[PDB]
């Protein structure tokens, strides 16, 4: 409809100006309206939402690593101020994940149909993803209720993706790539990380020529994001 | 992060569209003319900010004759014996021009020796010749197909022979080996060479009049190209016969098994056994010497001595899977391609790198001339021309 | 009903009734039908030619005769249809058009039903249609009864699609195959040629004036590919027959050039304009827009691929076929319809190439488009992919319409002065060929010395040759020798020439010496050697010329008496002749004749050229003859016998100019050796360069030279490359170099294995020595200590080396805080090479602290092949930034990532770096690192990024290489 | 008035522009060129060269006409000459 | 706590990349107390410089799409464009409006006689902060703008060359905005190049005076007005 259509224009424009405070926004109230979302307006969300936590999250990082120091030093005044600055980072995190979470649980994770397969799998890496975000600033109990949150969506994600998709599909590689990070990094596996990585990289590998020419960039992208985390983990 | 999109393909090699020609500047200049006797009836502010974070005309020497291009070679720091002469390396790759197949590019093929470019794609197979002096070429001399003779079928390889009298191509779903003869006054289809249930994906020939062929389920299977009949089949495992060298009597095969086995033609039996840490992906022979060269999958060139066969040595260690390779006419030096946007040269005692080129994307496949003067790069969709500076 | 159909076929073709004869063409044309090589039968031919020769023709005495007996059987239909006068816009169908075109036979079920087995299609003319050829996935019609635009339809029959297994036969020029041959499946092609070449040359004879020197102009006419082989048609034939006769009876009258297909080509259209009108007047206030709009569009079909022209193509330009005939006496339009439609032709295309020429030529004189009517729906952003082929023509007539006396009648005939403005644009593009970075092309050289030519004028040709300085000549046909003769006259800026003879000079037989049409002998003299004369008299005449390169010539002994008697004129001030890799052993005798007649003559480069005993007893009596001013002498790769070198040391030990000497390449005995001492000891002995790489010396012979050499005080420049040098050797040699009046300065031992005792005694003769500047160590196995030797023995303040050559040594990062230590200390060290030495990243931040504090005179660096990442990057440019003293860096063959290549430019943009030469292959980076290179190149003019770091020469570094 | 040949398929139509003319005796050419096609189209293929012989002439001539790039023609020129020397002695 | 916490909490804002934070931080500092640093001074700049580049580069950008797109005259389109780039407009203005406020109210009328770097700077500053209000405005406010900017840019220009050294990273820095705002803002095909002239042959005669201490800002700027002045000469 004509709103719609007016939303995706605007957060088309706020994605050229780079506003991606405005185009999430654009983004959340074109998905409000309860009616299914094409391949664009997906990816246009992914990316507004993945830009603004990005953003946060390298904040964060570069804010406990100077804490950390601060902290071997040891003026008090210091760590109560740097303390209070990443507890207001964690919160705008935490409120942002939390907005993307509620979102997708409301609406389209559950308009989806059952014969739509590729939908179900973008959305439920999406939630694991979304929920890897707050498991990485999460302490105590929390922190093992979101991991194991993000460990039923994958692995749903996962098995949903395993018997419906060619292997070389460029979702079921950034699914795959995903599953291996958060293995090494949230659960500290690098057994089951290696070995994951180099089971799709093989399958990749094996039906590398058959693979269709408008997908053969986005999976030759991924596919070398891969092996290459392999070739870390190794060394 | 080292997670997804974790800066892939952030950066972007803009193509310049290389008008560097006298002859078309003259014609440009001339046909600007027309234009405007019809028509009558930068950097913004360079301010306090800081440029260096990423966000008299030139003309190129023409391919005189689709051959040569007629110009001076570099100066060396030191004179050279007569030996260390015969033997030269590549200092730079100009490119000179641009074919451009409509469609994704799987082949490429030269044989300098009568100036044609054969491109192999999955629809057909373009022919084009060298001698057109144009900054970009999109009309072949003949364009090939097969698709007519069958439902629907694919082409995958495509083979060049040693004379450039015969062309072989194979694909999937073929009901054989198709053959065209290039010495005749018309180009035609000749033979047919029956595989009727598999698939080819490597192709080969031998100076005896025979041709051979190994397909995916690991059947090596040898043609008698004079009466086309079966001589000989050999099994492997699956996927195991990707790659195909032929020697004095032995063929070399490595799949992505990660196992490279010698058979033997006199007793049709394998006479070695090899493991590697992974797939391999391309194969090549020197011309001179006894080096067979192994491109992995996870980016090691390795060495191996055909002769003596004691052990493989690791030379240089690439940031991205080989899908090609290929040695020069002299056994001096070797180009590698692979899926990171770039042509790599590398030396032959130790494998040091010598420059790169920057492409546009997966590079899939390459070839070179016997005289090696040309390298013909085949990208997305466009074969392009480069020209090897000594 | 066949019989109706025949005879309506031979009723129809009513236009010739004489060249019904059966011939050999025609039985070729026939059996070639039959499955060719073992079995193939191809179903597709396609006849080339050029345009006007025999075609149509052809294909109509074809379709004729098949109607006759006696030709094509086992065929049914032989349906034909010129494509000319079909619109290609007409949504007329197969079966309906066969309807239309055919009178009063309709047997449409008939003849549907009756063969659709073995038809045979002849298309006549469809050369062109290449222009309307959408070529983007047409619509293959599968069957007849398909209303599609007959184009369309005829682009499904090409490709096989509609009524496959019927034979066809296609007529076309050789320019429409651009995108015809990659239609059609599996064709035979039939080349069909012209008059002939002996016609085509008795015809031109026929008509020559026969007052004076005739016989040049008729060469040059039957010379001159571009006119002969467009001769072929006999139209133009005929038309070149006319020319010359109007010339012949306008003896005084008409004063145009009388070849070049211009000069001769516009005598026609200028004189048969009118009959009225005796005196020189303008032609009148309305025949000036009939030509200007016939000319226009003349020029936009050449632009559009167009040949035929149609009602709506005229009353555009406000022209009418009647309006041309009064202006002209002939008929320039041609009307070939035969009903509504008239599609007007041009009489051969080359009278549409001139017309469009000449509308460049006359277009600014006054707004002619104010008299037109131009829509075409906004000229449709028009587009071309004409690319060069087909525009030569206009092109060459474009060129030739600048001459005088063509100008001077256009003035007359439009009562105003006549100065287009391509004259400018021409002389422009022929600047920007003449000026290149990299030397110039031979074959734009060529081509535009041929586009020269054609104009016979001298203010137009010399203001377009004057920015030269250097030419590259590839010579393989007589015309060329012909157009480089005439164009070199003009090259007043002329230094140097290079020019390449592969095959036309190479024999001496007067057999094949056109006998066709021969003039008397006696009167006359070979073709071939006369213009040979001529070019070396116009070589000889120039005044600035100085360097002469044979580049691989294989001339013969006439041919090189002929260039050695030529060079030998007063006036030639040729100073360094260069016969490497050129067969000169013919006419060596004169060369030796000419070496002491020529004063001017100081350099000779003679090597790869074998020499026997009288050639060098002859050489050495040459040299000693008072006349001489040879002072180099490059002797390198001739097989030296003994004997040879009893004459050298004759020659060295009498009185001669001889200053220089290479002796490369060619093993030199012991016995000679001992000649050679004997030669070099004496007083009487002023040499100062000696070249000896690449020899057979022993450490015997090196022991001997050394030994000669002591007593000799002129000697200045040595060079022992590529020999077996042992330490008693170097001792030797460093003995030689203690004692004073020595006098030597550059020493190079460029591939002698030395052991770290001789560096030992090299470090103690430089740590207090004079006169001795250039020392090059390249590809020695020296390391760390040896170095660490070196570098204390140049640390004191009384040494003199000046430039150090370490390329290939091998030294690592354990020599690189002493090498700056050095670097710092040093106050006469300017040029230091590194060029293969695995200093790695920390070795050369090791290196960086000593180069940025700029307390030195170093000026030339050489850190190429270094392995060197992105590490050291902050280093360098922290060097770099700050170092006023450096001019020259090599940086080739080094893995630099984006962001280290950054941080490069950016130190390179800033103002105190004075950088004049940067070695980087610019190709071999992103775009971003592209265009801050771009960048600082357009900051600062007078930077050479090139990857040929050593091709820059200040002082004289690579005299043992010449 | 017309002269008609056979274009190989591999040798570019950019090359039947430039030929090469020459002129030697019909006495010779005519065992030169023999009868048959054979080893014609193979030094044709060897050499990348075109060779059209032809023998109206003023009666007792050879107009042969060599097409391709300068090398080929140098290569057909030599072959030719070599050939007719050897037969002439 | 005050002014010396709010100092290190902006210092970890320019860590972390959030110049917001910054600009609240020194926005406080220089309200709470008269006197100002060195060090406070320059990240007091640095922080407003970021922010307004952003507002002006998306400013930039939607200008460039609306003048492409006004061609066609959609009467839809053309209203969300305009009103967007009125959005991004008046947070443009707002913030500038801010920073010449505070200028004014404190900087300004806090120095003393004696200061001269101070002086020269903050008039530098309100010269570039009208000349940023200027180059989106039309009409008499833009006329009005335009004539501050000269007035500060002029004041500020007298005093530097009358007592700054010519090396002097600051001086050069205004002789660059100076020659830039005349060649941009309203009119100087040799006014500008011959400012910037004099500017580069001033500095590269002294250079020695420059030492090693502020080597790399001195070059950088010397480099810039090189090539603005090449580009002037060249069009």
């Given at each position: 409809?004509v709103?719609?259509?007016?939303?995706?224009?605007?957060?088309?424009?706020?994605?050229?100006?780079?506003?991606?405070?405005?185009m999430?926004?654009?983004?959340?109230n074109?998905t409000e309206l309860?009616?299914?979302?094409?391949?664009?307006?997906?990816?246009?969300?992914?990316?507004?939402?993945?830009?603004?936590?990005?953003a946060?999250?390298?904040?964060?990082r570069?804010?406990?690593?100077?804490?950390?120091?601060?902290?071997?030093?040891?003026?008090?005044?210091?760590?109560?101020?740097?303390?209070?600055?990443?507890?207001?980072?964690?919160?705008?995190?935490?409120?942002?994940?939390?907005?993307?979470?509620?979102?997708?649980?409301?609406?389209?994770?559950?308009?989806?149909?059952?014969?739509?397969?590729?939908?179900?799998?973008?959305?439920?890496?999406?939630?694991?993803?979304?929920?890897?975000?707050?498991?990485?600033?999460?302490?105590?109990?929390?922190?093992?209720?979101?991991?194991?949150s993000?460990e039923?969506?994958?692995?749903?994600?996962?098995?949903?993706?395993?018997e419906?998709?060619?292997?070389?599909?460029?979702?079921?590689?950034?699914?795959?790539?995903?599953?291996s990070?958060?293995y090494?990094?949230?659960?500290?596996?690098?057994?089951?990380?290696c070995?994951?990585?180099?089971?799709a990289?093989?399958?990749?590998?094996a039906?590398?020529?058959?693979?269709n020419?408008?997908?053969?960039?986005?999976?030759?992208?991924?596919?070398?994001?891969?092996?290459?985390?392999?070739?870390?983990?190794?060394? | 992060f080292?997670?997804e999109?974790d800066?892939?393909?952030?950066?972007?090699?803009v193509?310049?569209?290389?008008?560097?020609?006298?002859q078309?500047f003259?014609?440009?200049?001339?046909?600007?003319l027309?234009?405007?006797?019809?028509?009558?009836?930068?950097?913004?502010?360079?301010?306090?900010?800081?440029?260096?974070?990423?966000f008299?005309?030139?003309?190129?020497?023409?391919?005189?004759?689709?051959?040569?291009?007629?110009?001076?070679?570099?100066?060396?720091?030191?004179?050279?014996?007569?030996?260390?002469?015969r033997?030269?390396?590549?200092?730079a790759?100009?490119?000179?021009?641009?074919l451009?197949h409509?469609?994704?590019?799987?082949?490429?093929a030269?044989?300098?020796?009568?100036?044609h470019?054969?491109?192999?794609?999955?629809?057909g197979?373009?022919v084009?010749?060298?001698?057109?002096?144009?900054?970009?070429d999109?009309?072949?001399?003949?364009?090939?197909?097969?698709?007519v003779?069958?439902?629907?079928?694919?082409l995958?390889?495509?083979?060049?022979?040693?004379?450039?009298?015969?062309?072989?191509a194979?694909?999937?779903?073929?009901?054989?080996?198709?053959?065209?003869?290039?010495?005749?006054?018309?180009?035609?289809?000749?033979?047919?060479?029956?595989?009727?249930?598999?698939s080819?994906?490597?192709?080969?020939?031998?100076?005896?009049?025979?041709?051979?062929?190994?397909?995916?389920?690991?059947?090596?299977?040898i043609?008698?190209?004079?009466?086309?009949?079966?001589?000989?089949?050999?099994?492997?495992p699956?996927?195991?016969?990707?790659?195909l060298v032929?020697?004095?009597?032995?063929?070399?095969?490595?799949?992505?098994?990660?196992?490279?086995?010698?058979?033997?033609?006199?007793?049709?039996?394998?006479?070695?056994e090899?493991?590697?840490?992974?797939q391999?992906?391309?194969?090549?022979?020197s011309?001179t010497?006894?080096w067979?060269?192994?491109?992995?999958?996870?980016?090691?060139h390795?060495?191996?001595?055909?002769?003596?066969?004691?052990?493989?040595?690791?030379?240089?260690?690439?940031?991205?899977?080989?899908?090609g390779?290929?040695?020069?006419?002299?056994?001096?030096?070797?180009?590698?391609?692979?899926?990171?946007?770039?042509?790599?040269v590398?030396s032959?005692?130790?494998?040091?790198?010598?420059?790169?080129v920057?492409?546009?994307?997966?590079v899939?496949?390459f070839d070179?001339?016997?005289?090696?003067?040309l390298?013909?790069?085949?990208?997305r969709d466009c074969?392009?021309?480069?020209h090897?500076?000594? | 009903?066949?019989?109706?159909?025949?005879?309506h076929?031979?009723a129809?073709?009513?236009?010739?009734?004489?060249?019904?004869?059966?011939?050999?063409?025609?039985?070729?044309?026939?059996?070639?039908?039959?499955?060719?090589?073992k079995t193939?039968?191809?179903?597709?031919?396609?006849?080339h030619?050029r345009?006007?020769?025999?075609?149509?023709?052809?294909?109509?005495?074809?379709?004729?005769?098949?109607?006759?007996?006696?030709?094509?059987?086992?065929?049914?239909?032989?349906?034909?249809?010129?494509?000319?006068?079909?619109?290609?816009?007409?949504?007329?169908?197969l079966?309906?058009?066969?309807?239309?075109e055919?009178?009063?036979?309709?047997?449409?079920?008939?003849?549907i039903?009756?063969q659709?087995?073995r038809?045979?299609?002849?298309?006549?003319?469809?050369?062109?249609?290449?222009?309307?050829?959408?070529?983007?996935?047409?619509?293959?019609?599968?069957?007849?009864?398909?209303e599609?635009?007959?184009?369309?339809?005829?682009?499904?029959?090409?490709?096989?699609?509609?009524?496959?297994?019927?034979?066809?036969?296609?007529?076309?020029?050789?320019?429409?195959?651009?995108?015809?041959?990659?239609?059609?499946?599996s064709?035979?092609?039939?080349?069909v040629?012209g008059?002939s070449?002996?016609?085509?040359?008795?015809?031109?004879?026929?008509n020559?004036?026969?007052?004076?020197?005739?016989?040049?102009?008729?060469?040059?006419?039957?010379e001159?590919?571009?006119?002969?082989?467009?001769?072929?048609?006999?139209?133009?034939?005929?038309?070149?027959?006319?020319?010359?006769?109007?010339?012949?009876?306008?003896?005084?009258?008409?004063?145009?050039?009388?070849?070049?297909?211009?000069?001769?080509?516009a005598?026609?259209?200028?004189?048969?304009?009118?009959?009225?009108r005796?005196?020189?007047?303008?032609?009148?206030?309305?025949?000036?827009?009939?030509?200007?709009?016939?000319?226009?569009?003349?020029?936009?079909?050449?632009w559009?691929?167009?040949?035929?022209?149609?009602?709506?193509?005229?009353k555009?330009?406000?022209?009418?076929?009647?309006?041309?005939?009064?202006?002209?006496?002939?008929?320039?339009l041609?009307?070939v319809?035969?009903?509504?439609?008239?599609?007007?032709?041009?009489?051969?295309?080359?009278?549409?190439?001139f017309?469009?020429?000449?509308?460049?030529?006359?277009?600014?004189?006054?707004?002619?488009?104010?008299?037109?009517?131009?829509?075409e729906?906004?000229?449709?952003?028009?587009?071309?992919?004409?690319?060069?082929?087909?525009?030569?023509?206009?092109?060459?007539?474009?060129?030739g319409?600048?001459?005088?006396?063509?100008?001077?009648?256009?003035?007359?005939?439009?009562?105003?002065?006549?100065?287009?403005?391509?004259?400018?644009?021409?002389?422009?593009?022929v600047?920007?060929?003449?000026?290149?970075?990299?030397g110039?092309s031979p074959?734009?050289?060529?081509?535009?010395?041929?586009?020269?030519?054609e104009?016979?004028?001298?203010e137009?040709?010399?203001?377009?040759?004057?920015?030269?300085?250097?030419?590259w000549?590839l010579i393989?046909?007589?015309?060329?020798?012909?157009?480089?003769?005439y164009?070199?006259?003009?090259?007043?800026?002329?230094?140097?020439?290079?020019?390449?003879?592969?095959?036309?000079?190479?024999?001496?037989?007067?057999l094949?010496?056109?006998?066709?049409?021969?003039?008397?002998?006696?009167?006359?003299?070979?073709?071939?050697?006369?213009?040979?004369?001529?070019?070396?008299?116009?070589?000889?005449?120039?005044?600035?010329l100085?360097?002469?390169?044979?580049?691989?010539?294989?001339?013969?002994?006439?041919?090189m008496?002929?260039?050695c008697?030529?060079?030998?004129?007063?006036?030639?001030?040729?100073?360094?002749?260069?016969?490497?890799?050129?067969?000169?052993?013919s006419?060596?005798?004169?060369?030796?004749?000419?070496?002491?007649?020529?004063?001017?003559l100081?350099?000779?480069?003679?090597?790869?050229?074998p020499?026997?005993?009288?050639?060098?007893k002859?050489?050495?009596?040459?040299?000693?003859?008072?006349?001489?001013?040879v002072?180099?002498?490059?002797?390198?790769?001739?097989?030296?016998?003994?004997?040879?070198?009893?004459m050298?040391?004759?020659?060295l030990?009498?009185?001669?100019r001889?200053?220089?000497?290479?002796?490369?390449?060619?093993?030199?005995?012991?016995?000679?050796?001992?000649?050679?001492?004997?030669?070099?000891?004496?007083?009487?002995?002023?040499?100062?360069?000696?070249?000896?790489?690449?020899?057979?010396?022993?450490?015997?012979?090196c022991?001997?030279?050394?030994?000669?050499?002591?007593?000799?005080?002129n000697?200045?420049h040595?060079?022992?490359?590529?020999?077996?040098?042992?330490?008693?050797?170097?001792?030797?040699?460093?003995?030689?170099?203690?004692?004073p009046?020595?006098?030597?300065?550059?020493?190079?031992?460029?591939?002698?294995?030395?052991?770290?005792?001789?560096y030992?005694?090299?470090?103690?003769?430089?740590?207090?020595?004079?006169?001795?500047?250039?020392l090059?160590?390249?590809m020695?196995?020296?390391?760390?200590?040896?170095?660490?030797?070196?570098?204390?023995?140049?640390?004191?303040?009384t040494?003199?080396?000046?430039?150090?050559?370490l390329?290939?040594?091998?030294?690592?990062?354990n020599?690189?805080?002493?090498?700056?230590?050095?670097?710092?200390?040093?106050?006469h060290l300017?040029?230091?090479?590194?060029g293969?030495?695995?200093?790695?990243?920390?070795?050369?931040?090791?290196?960086?602290?000593?180069?940025?504090?700029?307390?030195?005179?170093?000026?030339?660096?050489?850190?190429?092949?270094?392995?060197?990442?992105?590490?050291?990057?902050?280093?360098?440019?922290?060097?770099?930034?700050?170092?006023?003293?450096?001019?020259?860096?090599?940086?080739?063959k080094?893995?630099?990532?984006?962001?280290?290549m950054?941080?490069?430019?950016?130190?390179?943009?800033?103002?105190?770096?004075?950088?004049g030469?940067?070695?980087?292959?610019?190709?071999?980076?992103?775009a971003?690192?592209?265009?801050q290179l771009?960048?600082?190149?357009?900051?600062?003019?007078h930077?050479?990024?090139?990857?040929?770091?050593?091709?820059?020469?200040?002082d004289?570094?690579?005299?043992?290489?010449? | 008035?017309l002269?008609?040949?056979?274009?190989?398929?591999?040798?570019?139509?950019?090359?039947?522009?430039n030929?090469?003319?020459?002129?030697?005796?019909?006495?010779?050419?005519?065992?030169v060129?023999?009868?048959?096609?054979?080893?014609?189209?193979?030094?044709?293929?060897?050499?990348?060269?075109?060779?059209?012989?032809?023998?109206?002439?003023?009666?007792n001539?050879?107009?042969i006409?060599?097409?391709?790039?300068?090398?080929?023609?140098?290569?057909?020129?030599?072959?030719?000459?070599?050939?007719a020397?050897?037969?002439?002695?």
């Open positions: 409809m709103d719609r259509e007016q939303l995706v224009q605007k957060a088309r424009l706020a994605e050229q100006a780079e506003r991606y405070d405005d999430a926004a654009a983004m959340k074109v309860n009616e299914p979302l094409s391949n664009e307006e997906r990816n246009l969300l992914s990316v507004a939402y993945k830009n603004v936590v990005g946060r999250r390298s904040s964060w570069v804010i406990s690593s100077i804490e950390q120091k601060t902290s071997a030093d040891g003026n008090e005044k210091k760590i109560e101020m740097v303390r209070a600055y990443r507890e207001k980072i964690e919160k705008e995190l935490e409120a942002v994940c939390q907005d993307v979470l509620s979102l997708l649980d409301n609406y389209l994770i559950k308009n989806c149909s059952e014969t739509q397969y590729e939908s179900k799998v973008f959305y439920l890496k999406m939630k694991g993803d979304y929920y890897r975000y707050l498991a990485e600033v999460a302490t105590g109990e929390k922190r093992a209720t979101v991991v194991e993000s039923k969506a994958y692995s749903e994600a996962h098995e949903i993706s395993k419906h998709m060619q292997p070389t599909h460029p979702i079921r590689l950034g699914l795959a790539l995903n599953y990070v958060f090494y990094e949230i659960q500290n596996a690098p057994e089951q990380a070995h994951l990585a180099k089971t990289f093989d399958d990749a590998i039906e590398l020529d058959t693979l020419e408008d997908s053969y960039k986005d999976s030759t992208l991924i596919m070398q994001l891969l092996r290459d985390n392999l070739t870390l983990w190794t060394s | 080292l997670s999109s800066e892939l393909q952030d950066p972007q090699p193509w310049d569209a290389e008008p560097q020609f006298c078309g003259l014609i440009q200049g001339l046909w600007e027309f234009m405007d006797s019809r028509q009558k009836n930068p950097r913004h502010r360079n301010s306090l900010s800081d440029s260096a974070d990423p008299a005309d030139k003309f190129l020497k023409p391919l005189s004759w689709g051959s040569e291009v007629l110009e001076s070679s570099c100066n060396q720091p030191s004179t050279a014996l007569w030996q260390l002469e033997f030269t390396v590549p200092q790759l100009q490119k000179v021009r641009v451009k409509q469609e994704l590019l799987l082949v490429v030269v044989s300098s020796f009568t100036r470019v054969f491109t192999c794609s999955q629809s197979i373009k084009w010749n060298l001698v057109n002096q144009v900054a970009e999109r009309d072949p001399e003949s364009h090939l197909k097969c698709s003779q069958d439902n629907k079928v694919y995958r390889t495509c083979l060049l022979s040693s004379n450039s009298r015969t062309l072989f194979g694909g999937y779903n073929l009901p054989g080996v198709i053959v065209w003869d290039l010495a005749a006054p018309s180009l035609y289809e000749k033979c047919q060479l029956p595989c009727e249930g598999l080819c994906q490597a192709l080969a020939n031998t100076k005896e009049n025979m041709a051979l062929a190994g397909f995916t389920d690991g059947t090596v299977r043609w008698d190209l004079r009466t086309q009949e079966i001589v000989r089949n050999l099994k492997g699956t996927n195991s016969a990707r790659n032929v020697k004095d009597d032995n063929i070399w095969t490595g799949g992505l098994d990660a196992c490279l086995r010698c058979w033997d033609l006199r007793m049709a039996k394998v006479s070695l090899h493991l590697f840490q992974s391999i992906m391309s194969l090549a022979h011309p010497e006894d067979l060269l192994l491109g992995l999958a996870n980016g090691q390795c060495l191996f001595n055909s002769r003596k066969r004691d052990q493989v040595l690791t030379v240089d260690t690439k940031d991205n899977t080989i899908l390779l290929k040695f020069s006419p002299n056994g001096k030096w070797w180009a590698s391609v692979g899926m990171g946007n770039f042509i790599t590398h032959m005692p130790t494998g040091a790198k010598l420059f790169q920057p492409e546009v994307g997966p899939r496949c070179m001339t016997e005289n090696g003067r390298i013909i790069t085949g990208s074969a392009s021309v480069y090897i500076k000594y | 009903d066949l019989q109706d159909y025949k005879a076929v031979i129809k073709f009513d236009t010739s009734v004489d060249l019904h004869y059966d011939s050999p063409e025609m039985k070729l044309l026939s059996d070639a039908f039959k499955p060719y090589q193939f039968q191809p179903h597709t031919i396609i006849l030619g345009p006007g020769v025999g075609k149509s023709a052809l294909a109509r005495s074809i379709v004729l005769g098949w109607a006759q007996g006696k030709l094509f059987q086992k065929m049914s239909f032989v349906i034909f249809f010129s494509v000319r006068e079909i619109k290609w816009t007409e949504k007329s169908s079966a309906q058009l066969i309807a239309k055919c009178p009063d036979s309709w047997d449409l079920v008939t003849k039903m009756s659709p087995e038809l045979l299609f002849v298309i006549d003319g469809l050369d062109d249609m290449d222009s309307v050829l959408q070529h983007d996935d047409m619509t293959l019609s599968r069957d007849w009864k398909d599609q635009p007959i184009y369309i339809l005829m682009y499904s029959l090409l490709r096989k699609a509609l009524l496959p297994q019927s034979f066809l036969i296609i007529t076309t020029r050789n320019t429409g195959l651009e995108k015809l041959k990659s239609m059609v499946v064709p035979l092609y039939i080349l040629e008059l070449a002996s016609r085509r040359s008795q015809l031109v004879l026929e020559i004036s026969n007052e004076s020197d005739r016989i040049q102009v008729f060469h040059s006419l039957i001159n590919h571009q006119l002969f082989d467009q001769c072929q048609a006999p139209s133009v034939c005929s038309l070149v027959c006319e020319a010359l006769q109007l010339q012949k009876k306008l003896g005084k009258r008409c004063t145009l050039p009388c070849q070049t297909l211009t000069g001769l080509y005598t026609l259209v200028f004189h048969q304009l009118t009959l009225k005796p005196s020189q007047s303008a032609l009148s206030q309305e025949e000036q827009i009939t030509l200007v709009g016939l000319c226009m569009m003349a020029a936009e079909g050449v559009t691929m167009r040949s035929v022209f149609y009602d709506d193509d005229l555009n330009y406000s022209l009418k076929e009647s309006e041309i005939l009064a202006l002209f006496h002939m008929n320039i041609l009307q319809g035969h009903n509504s439609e008239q599609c007007y032709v041009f009489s051969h295309l080359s009278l549409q190439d017309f469009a020429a000449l509308y460049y030529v006359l277009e600014g004189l006054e707004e002619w488009n104010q008299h037109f009517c131009f829509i729906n906004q000229r449709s952003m028009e587009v071309k992919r004409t690319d060069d082929t087909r525009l030569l023509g206009m092109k060459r007539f474009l060129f319409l600048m001459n005088k006396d063509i100008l001077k009648t256009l003035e007359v005939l439009f009562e105003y002065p006549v100065i287009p403005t391509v004259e400018q644009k021409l002389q422009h593009w600047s920007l060929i003449a000026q290149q970075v990299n110039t074959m734009d050289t060529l081509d535009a010395f041929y586009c020269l030519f104009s016979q004028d001298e137009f040709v010399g203001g377009a040759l004057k920015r030269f300085q250097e030419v000549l393989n046909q007589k015309m060329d020798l012909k157009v480089s003769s164009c070199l006259k003009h090259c007043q800026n002329l230094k140097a020439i290079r020019v390449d003879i592969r095959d036309l000079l190479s024999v001496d037989n007067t094949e010496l056109c006998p066709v049409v021969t003039v008397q002998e006696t009167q006359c003299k070979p073709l071939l050697m006369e213009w040979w004369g001529n070019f070396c008299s116009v070589l000889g005449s120039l005044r600035n100085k360097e002469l390169d044979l580049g691989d010539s294989i001339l013969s002994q006439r041919a008496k002929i260039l008697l030529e060079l030998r004129n007063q006036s030639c001030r040729i100073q360094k002749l260069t016969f490497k890799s050129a067969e000169v052993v006419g060596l005798k004169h060369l030796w004749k000419l070496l002491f007649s020529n004063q001017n100081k350099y000779l480069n003679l090597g790869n050229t020499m026997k005993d009288d050639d060098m002859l050489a050495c009596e040459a040299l000693k003859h008072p006349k001489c001013s002072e180099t002498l490059r002797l390198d790769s001739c097989e030296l016998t003994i004997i040879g070198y009893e050298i040391s004759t020659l030990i009498s009185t001669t001889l200053k220089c000497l290479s002796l490369a390449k060619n093993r030199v005995g012991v016995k000679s050796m001992i000649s050679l001492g004997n030669a070099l000891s004496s007083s009487m002995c002023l040499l100062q360069k000696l070249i000896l790489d690449n020899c057979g010396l022993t450490p015997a012979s022991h001997l030279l050394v030994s000669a050499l002591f007593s000799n005080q000697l200045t040595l060079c022992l490359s590529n020999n077996s040098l042992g330490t008693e050797g170097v001792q030797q040699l460093c003995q030689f170099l203690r004692n009046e020595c006098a030597l300065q550059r020493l190079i031992l460029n591939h002698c294995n030395i052991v770290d005792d001789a030992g005694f090299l470090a103690m003769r430089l740590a207090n020595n004079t006169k001795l500047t250039h090059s160590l390249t020695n196995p020296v390391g760390d200590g040896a170095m660490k030797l070196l570098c204390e023995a140049l640390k004191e303040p040494c003199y080396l000046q430039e150090l050559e390329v290939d040594c091998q030294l690592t990062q020599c690189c805080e002493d090498l700056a230590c050095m670097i710092t200390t040093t106050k300017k040029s230091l090479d590194l293969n030495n695995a200093l790695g990243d920390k070795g050369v931040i090791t290196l960086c602290e000593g180069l940025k504090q700029s307390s030195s005179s170093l000026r030339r660096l050489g850190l190429g092949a270094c392995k060197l990442t992105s590490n050291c990057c902050e280093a360098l440019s922290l060097a770099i930034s700050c170092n006023p003293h450096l001019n020259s860096l090599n940086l080739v080094n893995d630099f990532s984006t962001s280290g950054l941080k490069l430019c950016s130190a390179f943009q800033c103002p105190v770096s004075n950088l030469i940067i070695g980087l292959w610019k190709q071999e980076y992103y971003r690192v592209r265009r771009e960048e600082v190149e357009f900051v600062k003019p930077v050479v990024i090139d990857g040929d770091w050593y091709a820059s020469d200040e004289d570094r690579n005299w043992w290489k010449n | 008035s002269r008609l040949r056979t274009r190989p398929w591999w040798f570019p139509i950019q090359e039947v522009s030929p090469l003319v020459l002129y030697m005796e019909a006495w010779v050419a005519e065992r060129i023999g009868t048959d096609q054979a080893e014609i189209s193979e030094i044709e293929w060897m050499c990348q060269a075109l060779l059209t012989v032809d023998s109206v002439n003023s009666g001539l050879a107009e006409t060599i097409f391709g790039q300068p090398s080929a023609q140098t290569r057909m020129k030599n072959i030719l000459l070599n050939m020397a050897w037969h002439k002695e």
